[PDB]
C-alpha cells in the first residue's frame, strides 16, 4: 500500500514534486513510467495474441549465430519472437504478438535476437525480463493532472519504489527531515 | 548576486519549491518573509518620522525597573520607544514612529521595554537588532506569482541565505545531487 500524494508540479520534465501530510516526495517521472510499462510487458510476456506482419522480415546469420538461435527457439517464442527456418543460416518472421509496440516491431524483434546472440547462453527467466525491459524503453513536461494519473498508476505496481534496474524511483523528505535542514 | 529561480509551487503553506538550470531550490517562506521584513525595520531603526498615539500609554514599574529604564532611555528612543516621565516609577508614551506596525504599537512598545528590563544591561547594537526582529514577527498558501515576487524580494536582501536567527532559508539540490540519489 503506497501513500496517496498530491502533485505540486514538476521540473525539467524529469522530476515530479508531490506532497502529503508526511512531507515531500520527489519522483523520477521517466523511471516511474518505465516501472509501469515494465509490469505491463512483463505480464504480456509471461503468457498468445499473434498477428501477421505487414512487412515480414528476413534474417541472415553466420553458421554460429544460426545455431545459438536454434538452441533458444523456445525461449525466443516465449517473448514473442517467432523465427521460421528459411534455408541454412537464415530465418523469416511473418508474425508477432499484437501487443508489440506498433511501428517498432522490426527493431524490437532484431534487438531481442541480438541479446540472445550477445549472451550465447541465456535463461528464459532472464530473457523474459530483458525483453520486457526493451519493450518498456520503446523529456515531456506534465500537467498536474497527468502527474496525478501517473502517481496513481505507479502506486498500483508491485514495486513502486524501485525501477526494473534497481534505481530508486521515489525520494521522500518528511516534515521533520525538512525542519531539520532549516534549523 | 542570487540566482534567478522560477516557482514550481508550494506545500503546507510553509515550503516553497522553485527551480532553474542548476536544480531544485526549497525555501522556508516564513523565514524568508522574516529576513525581508527584518532588513526593512532594521534600517528604519538605524535612523525620525514620529506620530501621535491615538491612545497614549501609561506604565507603572517598580523602583528597580524605572531605574533600568532611565539607564536605557537613549537606547529605547533609538528603536522608537519614547518614554516620558510621569511621576516616580511611572512613564507615559504619547507618540511613536509612523513606520510602527499599525494596530500593534502598544504591544510592541511594551515588548521592547520588557526586553530591556529582562536584560538589565543591553547594548544599543543588540537592542536595535532585537527590536527589529520583534517588528518582523508582527500559514498562508501562496500562488506562483506571489512566490515569484517573494523570491525576488529575498534575492535583494543583504543576507538571502540566512534568517535573522541564523537558520538556513534556502536549501538547494543540484542536477547532480538529484541524479545521485536516484542512482
Amino acid at each position: 500500500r503506497v501513500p496517496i500524494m498530491y502533485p505540486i508540479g514538476q521540473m525539467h520534465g524529469t522530476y515530479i514534486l508531490a506532497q502529503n501530510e508526511n512531507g515531500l516526495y520527489i519522483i523520477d517521472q521517466h523511471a516511474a513510467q518505465e516501472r509501469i510499462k515494465y509490469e505491463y510487458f512483463r505480464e504480456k510476456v509471461g503468457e498468445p495474441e499473434v498477428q501477421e506482419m505487414i512487412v515480414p522480415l528476413t534474417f541472415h546469420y553466420s553458421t554460429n549465430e544460426a545455431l545459438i538461435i536454434e538452441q533458444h527457439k523456445q525461449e525466443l517464442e516465449s517473448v514473442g519472437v517467432f523465427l521460421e527456418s528459411f534455408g541454412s543460416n537464415s530465418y523469416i518472421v511473418r508474425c508477432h504478438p499484437a501487443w508489440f509496440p506498433k511501428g517498432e516491431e522490426a527493431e524490437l524483434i532484431e534487438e531481442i535476437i541480438q541479446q540472445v546472440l550477445d549472451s550465447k547462453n541465456i535463461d528464459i527467466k532472464k530473457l523474459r525480463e530483458e525483453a520486457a525491459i526493451m519493450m518498456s524503453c520503446k523529456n515531456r513536461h506534465l500537467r498536474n493532472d497527468e502527474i496525478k494519473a501517473l502517481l496513481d498508476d505507479l502506486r498500483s505496481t508491485s514495486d513502486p519504489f524501485t525501477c526494473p534496474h534497481g534505481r530508486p524511483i521515489i525520494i521522500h523528505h518528511s516534515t521533520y527531515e525538512m525542519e531539520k535542514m532549516f534549523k
Side-chain angles (χ1 to χ4, degrees), chain A residues 37 40-42 44-45 53 57 59 61 76 78-83 93 95-116 127-138:
Chain A
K37 283 190 298 181
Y40 167 81
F41 290 110
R42 176 210 53 195
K44 288 290 187 177
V45 159
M53 284 201 70
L57 304 173
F59 289 117
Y61 306 97
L76 276 173
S78 185
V79 300
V81 175
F82 300 112
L83 286 156
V93 190
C95 69
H96 70 254
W99 45 259
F100 266 33
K102 303 298 180 184
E104 275 170 308
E105 296 88 324
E107 309 78 4
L108 171 68
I109 287 176
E110 189 179 354
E111 183 190 343
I112 290 182
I113 292 165
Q114 195 57 50
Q115 178 61 18
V116 172
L127 190 59
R128 280 169 175 159
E129 172 163 294
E130 308 282 299
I133 294 165
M134 303 174 185
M135 297 172 189
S136 300
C137 296
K138 299 198 176 303

Side-chain angles (χ1 to χ4, degrees), chain A residues 142-156:
Chain A
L142 319 172
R143 302 177 307 275
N144 276 17
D145 51 8
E146 288 185 319
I147 295 176
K148 183 68 181 180
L150 188 158
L151 296 188
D152 286 337
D153 287 359
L154 179 63
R155 173 176 314 105
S156 66

Side-chain angles (χ1 to χ4, degrees), chain A residues 6-70:
Chain A
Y6 318 91
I8 304 171
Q10 63 85 224
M11 58 167 289
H12 296 211
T14 69
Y15 298 111
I16 284 177
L17 301 172
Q19 63 80 28
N20 58 33
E21 297 219 20
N22 301 342
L24 179 63
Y25 302 82
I26 311 176
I27 301 87
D28 181 350
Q29 76 178 51
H30 291 282
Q33 285 173 302
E34 289 176 342
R35 158 59 61 175
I36 292 164
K37 283 190 298 181
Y38 169 71
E39 293 196 0
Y40 167 81
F41 290 110
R42 176 210 53 195
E43 195 218 16
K44 288 290 187 177
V45 159
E47 49 204 30
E49 305 176 351
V50 298
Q51 84 171 51
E52 161 188 310
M53 284 201 70
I54 313 173
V55 178
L57 304 173
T58 47
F59 289 117
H60 302 296
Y61 306 97
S62 63
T63 296
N64 193 219
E65 285 164 330
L67 200 62
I68 302 182
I69 284 163
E70 290 300 327

